[PDB]
Design a protein around this motif. Structure first.
Motif, PDB file in Angstrom:
ATOM      1  N   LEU A   3       3.214  35.102 -28.272  1.00 39.54           N
ATOM      2  CA  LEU A   3       3.401  36.059 -29.350  1.00 39.54           C
ATOM      3  C   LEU A   3       2.247  37.048 -29.372  1.00 39.54           C
ATOM      4  CD1 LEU A   3       4.879  37.073 -31.833  1.00 39.54           C
ATOM      5  CD2 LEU A   3       3.434  35.525 -33.180  1.00 39.54           C
ATOM      6  N   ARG A  13       9.738  38.412 -36.418  1.00 41.89           N
ATOM      7  CA  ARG A  13      10.769  37.563 -35.831  1.00 41.89           C
ATOM      8  C   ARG A  13      10.290  36.128 -35.696  1.00 41.89           C
ATOM      9  NH1 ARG A  13      13.827  36.726 -30.599  1.00 41.89           N
ATOM     10  NH2 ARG A  13      11.738  36.948 -29.674  1.00 41.89           N
ATOM     11  N   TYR A  14       9.027  35.954 -35.301  1.00 40.24           N
ATOM     12  CA  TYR A  14       8.429  34.631 -35.216  1.00 40.24           C
ATOM     13  C   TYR A  14       8.409  33.964 -36.574  1.00 40.24           C
ATOM     14  CZ  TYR A  14       4.821  31.225 -33.702  1.00 40.24           C
ATOM     15  OH  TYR A  14       4.105  30.090 -33.371  1.00 40.24           O
ATOM     16  N   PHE A  17      11.771  32.711 -37.858  1.00 39.02           N
ATOM     17  CA  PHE A  17      12.150  31.418 -37.292  1.00 39.02           C
ATOM     18  C   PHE A  17      11.426  30.274 -37.999  1.00 39.02           C
ATOM     19  CE2 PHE A  17      10.949  27.894 -34.570  1.00 39.02           C
ATOM     20  CZ  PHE A  17      12.186  27.392 -34.187  1.00 39.02           C
ATOM     21  N   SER A  21      13.574  27.484 -40.183  1.00 36.53           N
ATOM     22  CA  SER A  21      13.804  26.228 -39.432  1.00 36.53           C
ATOM     23  C   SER A  21      13.758  25.011 -40.326  1.00 36.53           C
ATOM     24  CB  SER A  21      12.790  25.997 -38.353  1.00 36.53           C
ATOM     25  OG  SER A  21      12.949  24.711 -37.784  1.00 36.53           O
ATOM     26  N   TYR A  45       6.462  30.583 -28.033  1.00 37.69           N
ATOM     27  CA  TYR A  45       7.817  30.267 -28.473  1.00 37.69           C
ATOM     28  C   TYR A  45       8.740  30.315 -27.269  1.00 37.69           C
ATOM     29  CZ  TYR A  45       8.727  35.308 -28.236  1.00 37.69           C
ATOM     30  OH  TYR A  45       8.852  36.612 -27.818  1.00 37.69           O
ATOM     31  N   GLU A  47      13.053  31.037 -26.170  1.00 38.70           N
ATOM     32  CA  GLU A  47      14.305  31.629 -26.608  1.00 38.70           C
ATOM     33  C   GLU A  47      15.456  30.879 -25.950  1.00 38.70           C
ATOM     34  OE1 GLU A  47      13.936  35.751 -25.618  1.00 38.70           O
ATOM     35  OE2 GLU A  47      12.490  36.157 -27.217  1.00 38.70           O
ATOM     36  N   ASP A  48      16.588  30.908 -26.629  1.00 36.44           N
ATOM     37  CA  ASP A  48      17.820  30.320 -26.059  1.00 36.44           C
ATOM     38  C   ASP A  48      18.454  31.365 -25.141  1.00 36.44           C
ATOM     39  OD1 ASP A  48      19.054  32.172 -27.717  1.00 36.44           O
ATOM     40  OD2 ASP A  48      19.979  30.689 -29.030  1.00 36.44           O
ATOM     41  N   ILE A  53      15.044  32.821 -30.935  1.00 36.94           N
ATOM     42  CA  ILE A  53      13.953  31.824 -30.831  1.00 36.94           C
ATOM     43  C   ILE A  53      14.565  30.459 -31.163  1.00 36.94           C
ATOM     44  CG2 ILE A  53      11.742  31.092 -31.808  1.00 36.94           C
ATOM     45  CD1 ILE A  53      11.041  33.982 -32.295  1.00 36.94           C
ATOM     46  N   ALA A  56       8.970  26.907 -31.493  1.00 34.01           N
ATOM     47  CA  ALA A  56       7.741  27.674 -31.651  1.00 34.01           C
ATOM     48  C   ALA A  56       6.568  26.728 -31.880  1.00 34.01           C
ATOM     49  CB  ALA A  56       7.870  28.683 -32.796  1.00 34.01           C
ATOM     50  N   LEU A  90       8.136  24.126 -23.874  1.00 40.76           N
ATOM     51  CA  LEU A  90       7.325  24.849 -24.844  1.00 40.76           C
ATOM     52  C   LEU A  90       5.841  24.624 -24.583  1.00 40.76           C
ATOM     53  CD1 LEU A  90       7.054  26.569 -27.404  1.00 40.76           C
ATOM     54  CD2 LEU A  90       7.254  24.424 -28.643  1.00 40.76           C
TER      55      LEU A  90
END
Lengths: 332, 5
Positions: A3, A13-14, A17, A21, A45, A47-48, A53, A56, A90
């Motif tokens: 990030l 965006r982080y 998430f 979550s 983080y 991503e799919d 995301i 993280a 991760l």
DNA sequence: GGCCACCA
């Protein structure tokens, strides 16, 4: 990916998430790095395949007596850590970002201990610290045994009293019947009230306390819907306080203080109001935090058992990705 | 001390 | 937990 903390949209965006979550933790929010301003943030983080995301990890890097840093992801990562293939991916990103500067990456997620999970982690090269260690609350950075109230067991509960047996109802009613009143907020006024009770309690215990600026940075990083200070008084006299953070699936009672002398069960009144906040907001969990043992000799168990009748939660403990094994052996 | 936090 | 204590 790593990030870029200087890219505001990416940080948003982080944060979205982490905040949405089911695994979110306040100590994994980027706001915790503002609290831990003496540590260096490094965040990664995954991503799919749809660009979203999915996982993280917020790390903070601290100094040691060696040439290496200590990398620590407090109550992270934010994901299902039993998905160890995803965890490995991760952690691989995290190790890339750390660029050889740390001797270890430690993370202590709030996932239940199990022997099968412990063995899986060791099979993937991690070093784990749980039942293999302890020293109680000092064996790990965060306590591994925690008193957590599962409010989803009481879907129709309206008030704190609805959750408890009659003997506990009587204890909770007592401070209010004796004139204790609780207000709450997250302004400098409540902080000053907290800090008076906090330092007073620390002196009475002859123990060290955090500076007020620690809590001021936390008030700056978290608004009143996340951070709330509860203040119990009787006839204008300040008696006790507590700080609770609402984040993810839980409200966490994190800090507290009480004045010398007769406090009229005010800490029970604080707990009741904090639990009422969790009920009012439809929060799944109320976490009173660590205990040393399920025991009558543990003053932490005895107080918290008033409010948590189920077994304490026992977590997996500290998971160490060892990077410099020579320094690891020296310091751990 | 160490409750951590 | 044993009115008592606990009440980080």
């Amino acid at each position: 990916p790593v990030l870029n903390l200087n890219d505001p949209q990416a940080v948003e965006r982080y944060e979205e998430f982490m905040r949405q979550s089911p695994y979110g933790q306040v100590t994994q929010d980027l706001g915790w790095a503002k609290v831990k301003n003496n540590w260096e943030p490094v965040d990664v983080y995954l991503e799919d395949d749809q660009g979203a995301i999915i996982a993280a990890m917020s790390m903070l890097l601290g100094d040691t007596p060696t040439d290496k840093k200590f990398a620590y992801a407090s109550k992270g990562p934010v994901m299902d850590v039993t998905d160890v293939d995803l965890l490995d991916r991760l952690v691989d990103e995290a190790v890339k970002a750390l660029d050889g500067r740390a001797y270890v990456l430690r993370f202590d997620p709030e996932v239940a201990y199990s022997d099968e999970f412990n063995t899986t982690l060791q099979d993937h090269g991690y070093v784990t610290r749980n039942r293999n260690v302890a020293a109680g609350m000092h064996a790990t950075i965060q306590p591994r045994l925690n008193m957590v109230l599962d409010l989803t067991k009481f879907p129709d509960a309206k008030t704190t009293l609805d959750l408890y047996p009659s003997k506990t109802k009587s204890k909770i009613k007592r401070p209010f019947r004796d004139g204790v009143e609780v207000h709450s907020g997250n302004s400098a006024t409540e902080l000053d009230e907290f800090f008076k009770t906090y330092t007073t309690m620390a002196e009475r215990h002859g123990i060290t306390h955090r500076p007020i600026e620690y809590f001021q940075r936390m008030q700056a990083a978290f608004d009143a819907d996340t951070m709330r200070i509860f203040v119990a008084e009787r006839e204008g006299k300040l008696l006790s306080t507590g700080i609770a953070l609402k984040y993810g699936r839980k409200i966490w009672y994190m800090y507290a203080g009480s004045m010398d002398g007769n406090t009229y069960y005010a800490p029970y009144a604080v707990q009741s109001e904090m639990i009422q906040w969790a009920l009012d907001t439809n929060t799944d969990l109320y976490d009173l935090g660590g205990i040393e043992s399920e025991s009558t000799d543990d003053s932490l168990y005895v107080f918290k058992h008033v409010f948590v009748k189920d077994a304490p939660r026992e977590y997996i403990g500290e998971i160490d990705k060892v990077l410099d094994p020579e320094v690891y052996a020296e310091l751990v | 001390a160490x409750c951590x936090x």
